[PDB]
Amino acid sequence: GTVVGIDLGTTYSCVGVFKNGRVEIIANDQGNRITPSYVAFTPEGERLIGDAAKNQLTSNPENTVFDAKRLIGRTWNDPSVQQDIKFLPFKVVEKKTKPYIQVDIGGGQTKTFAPEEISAMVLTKMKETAEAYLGKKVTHAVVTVPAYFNDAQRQATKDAGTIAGLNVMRIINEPTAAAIAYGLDKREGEKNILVFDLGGGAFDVSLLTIDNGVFEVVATNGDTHLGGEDFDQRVMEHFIKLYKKKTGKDVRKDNRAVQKLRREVEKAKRALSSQHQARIEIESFFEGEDFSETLTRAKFEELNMDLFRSTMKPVQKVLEDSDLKKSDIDEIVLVGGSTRIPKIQQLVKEFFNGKEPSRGINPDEAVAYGAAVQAGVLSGDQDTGDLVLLDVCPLTLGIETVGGVMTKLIPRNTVVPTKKSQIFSTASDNQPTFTIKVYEGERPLTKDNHLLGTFDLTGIPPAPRGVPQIEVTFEIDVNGILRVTAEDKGTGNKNKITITNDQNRLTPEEIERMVNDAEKF
Amino acid sequence: GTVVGIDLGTTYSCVGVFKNGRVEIIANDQGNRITPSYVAFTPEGERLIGDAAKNQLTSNPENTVFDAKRLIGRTWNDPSVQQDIKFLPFKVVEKKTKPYIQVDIGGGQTKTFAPEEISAMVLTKMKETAEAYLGKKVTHAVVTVPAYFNDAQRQATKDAGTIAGLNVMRIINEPTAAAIAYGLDKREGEKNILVFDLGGGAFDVSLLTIDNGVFEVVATNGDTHLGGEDFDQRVMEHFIKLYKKKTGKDVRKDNRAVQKLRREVEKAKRALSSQHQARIEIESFFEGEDFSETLTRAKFEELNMDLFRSTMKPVQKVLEDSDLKKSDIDEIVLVGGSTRIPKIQQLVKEFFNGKEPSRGINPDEAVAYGAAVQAGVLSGDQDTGDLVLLDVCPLTLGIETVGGVMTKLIPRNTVVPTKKSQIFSTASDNQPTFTIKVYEGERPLTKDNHLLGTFDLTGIPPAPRGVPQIEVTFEIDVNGILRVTAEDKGTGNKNKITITNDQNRLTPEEIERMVNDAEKF
Ligand SMILES: Nc1ncnc2c1ncn2[C@@H]1O[C@H](COP(=O)(O)OP(=O)(O)O)[C@@H](O)[C@H]1O
């Protein structure tokens, strides 16, 4: 059917579709063009996906699942997994050497989910978002993954899609999808593309080359634990301390309160990408006490400046790993919501001596956008080939006229079988004979063409030069046999040659060389 | 250099060479195509090899050495050795558990020779025979051994050759060499070959199978003390008795006289394979008395009939040991001089219910002949490989034309890199668009082939169907990357796809299955 493009993100997922000449990024049933990569199991046994899972206020953070993408396709003893489980608030356990997420699904009933089963639930939500917009079933998808993902990680992502009811036609790299969204695949020459992807949870820098249709990921770097959520956490520590100082109320260890503030902090952060002040207000925040503070851009930047500056080192490293200078970068692509932060845009522009990044696609939708473009191309796989093969003459066929001139009867690329005729005459008064020399080739003089045969037409009646009309006909039959006739239209006197393939057939090497001189005259 | 084939025989040795398309069996300096496996040390300290050693009249048979092949590669306490030394007229002694031949080499000076040192002297004679014919040094040989020879016996034979200055490239079995001489290796199916080898000293019957290039020796039997020399000895006992009766002269215990008669008896025996009477005459045979008797075939047969009949039991035994019936024998190969005896040929033909043996190679040269054929094959080991590897397209590449038809642009096994083009047109009047679907596979309909990608060519100007000329080009570059272009030759409007290996590459298992349908159309 119609193929969708899905950005299956660490913190947010996005679905697009190429429809009626345009990429549409599809809003979910909450009206959001991105969906949290979140699943929550309630004590009553209800399952929440997306905004409802993330925005769910609970005193128990242990049955809310996120960051499945950190675990997908990995073994338990992967040092990345052993690091990650330390900070994840839900239980991760080993079963037959693989990490499983352990939750209470209802009334103390424990279940273990594979990371790809959690991601399958997120992809089900993205599928349904697309199905609501299109008003038809979605069966096929292009799904993106980080460039550094190995085969096990790509297959587990495929498996997530399969479980969600999607035929995952292609897994493509996130930075490549962003490049495709910006049309950078459709350009001539060797271009160097720096993709700077600062999302909610991770920072990924990729050096891609585009050369004559081929994308190569040359080098990757970044920080797997640096994203927008770390900036939120700096604002959080600050406002928790400030609230404690102003009211004596310590909101830490009350998860419900932490969630309400974190959500307001995240909205304020986004506002500070457009303006220099933002109000955080929560009516009855903590025991009838309202929350009311404002955050300046300067304070937001001050609380995070070390984290913002740290994004430049991975850029430096991919440049040296790709053996490129700053000036060798033809294209800067900003990906991820956090690239909307003016200080981040400033730090990247300054690093690249004032070079402007690509602009026009929302940075948190660009990967989904590129996936949707690629999905559009692959939806054409069910089209029908509406081409007819033509049988054509591979070389110009003609005769020698006075001065050793190649006079064409059947131009190269004439559809065969065919019959073509021209009228010829005498070069001298009372000329009694014609010699018809049949040539193959594209050169204007027959000395440079291939002789196929000769015959005479005798008994031309007396007349002044140019008066007799001799019709020369070239006929190629359904068997590709060439027959040449010369007939005196005055008398009906005629002669013919049948030209055979035997022993005076050019090799396809010889033909290619002759075809080089085609389209000169 | 040129490799020779040597039959190192119990009683006679034979050397051949594959030269200028033919096996030549090489005559020695006496003009004989076989050479006695004999060495003699004269009282004056001269060493004789071949005909000169055997034909040497002496009153001392103790310093003439033969039958080294009975001892080669064996231990002193081998029951075969303990049996054999009883009848051998030269001294055999034990040194460090191995049998040595002890002779007077000159003036009462004793020397002990390893059996392989005696065989090395015979192989030196065969090497020199070959060198005289070729007029160049012979460095390499294939040497034959009985099928029943163990590793020690094969190595001691190799060692004999090494001592004689030969690189013994291969030791091959006598019956296999005879089969090879008769071309029985170069035939289809499973064939059963009975090799009947009656030489001067031993009888060997071998059941070989030939199956798809592989020879197996399935069973062997025979009699190690039954050969032409036993037939000679029956004629000898008869004529010694007859001479004693007619003259009172007893030639026994006069070795010189015994030798002269034995030599005449052997020539008469050979004549009786071609005619039914033979004259034995020796002028001044014993004290001025001439010898003059004739021998009939009937008397020769009568004196030996029990020995001739005894050759059938070993044939019976190899048939039951190989679990075959007479009728299962596809090929009878007669080897050894004694197979020229008509009564022996008759007994074998009758045993096999009138089946004809192989014919055309002298039975006493057939083993050398096969060795020479094998030598010919191994002389090719110093040739140079004059092949160039081609880089070729493993599967047909093309596009879908109307009706879901696979229209090839690059046939399977086209040399790459390459560029191939065909001309296509519209299926309908004023058709505005082409869809180019790029397929890989050998099947005539693209539903059964592998889709590599699709692209469109838009903006085809109005014309009647079949009039526009769209050139489709398939290009495989030095990196094996496929690029497909479609260009409207009318306008220069064109589009292109670059096809990557990633995620739509067939497995070598899938390719093999598709290649099964190659060469159908
Ligand atoms: N205007 C904005 N200013 C600052 N951060 C933003 C803005 N919009 C979104 N973000 C942040 O972007 C992050 C999400 O990144 P995104 O690219 O959507 O996906 P992912 O986290 O899956 O890579 C969150 O931390 C979010 O707060």
Ligand SMILES: Nc1ncnc2c1ncn2[C@@H]1O[C@H](COP(=O)(O)OP(=O)(O)O)[C@@H](O)[C@H]1O
């Ligand atoms: N025409 C023949 N008739 C009978 N016996 C023959 C004939 N030619 C050769 N022989 C015998 O063949 C024997 C030699 O066998 P041969 O195959 O040459 O080698 P080997 O003894 O080494 O196996 C001798 O006994 C010789 O007399």
Ligand SMILES: [K+]
């Ligand atoms: K995302």
Ligand SMILES: [K+]
């Ligand atoms: K022999």
